[PDB]
């Protein structure tokens, strides 16, 4: 395992240091995109949440494409006010429910240590 707990203050410096491999490791899932939405990297451990292939879901657009229960007020609208200000942190319950059985979740969102990237973090409850 890499031992980083979800939800840590400063877990945006402990994640600039992993590669793909590296966070394939963590604990909880976790995803990172780009300020247009588009999944850059996309971990093990989330698509053991979610059913989808890691590989086959990178370039894709998160909002878009792969999640469209997502594209709400309630995650994509705080995920655009978030990167249109360049700031984010917000932490909240959703249920993840497109093409698979409905999954109940805690989701962090938080800017990246880098400039124009974003994590989406995501737990079972
Ligand atoms: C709603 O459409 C949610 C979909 C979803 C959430 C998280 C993922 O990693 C993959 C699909």
């Not at 370039?59 to 709400?72: L, R």
């Given at each position: 395992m890499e031992h980083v707990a979800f939800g840590s203050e400063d877990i945006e410096n402990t994640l600039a240091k992993m590669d793909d491999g590296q966070l394939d490791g963590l604990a909880f899932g976790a995803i990172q995109l780009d300020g247009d939405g588009n999944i850059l990297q996309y971990n093990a451990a989330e698509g053991d949440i979610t059913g989808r292939d890691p590989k086959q879901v990178i370039?894709?657009?998160?909002?878009?494409?792969?999640?469209?229960?997502?594209?709400?007020p309630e995650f994509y609208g705080k995920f655009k006010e978030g990167v249109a200000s360049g700031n984010l942190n917000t932490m909240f319950e959703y249920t993840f429910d497109y093409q698979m059985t409905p999954t109940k979740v805690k989701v962090h969102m938080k800017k990246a240590l880098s400039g124009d990237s974003y994590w989406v973090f995501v737990k079972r409850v």
């Open positions: 370039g894709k657009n998160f909002f878009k494409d792969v999640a469209p229960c997502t594209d709400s």
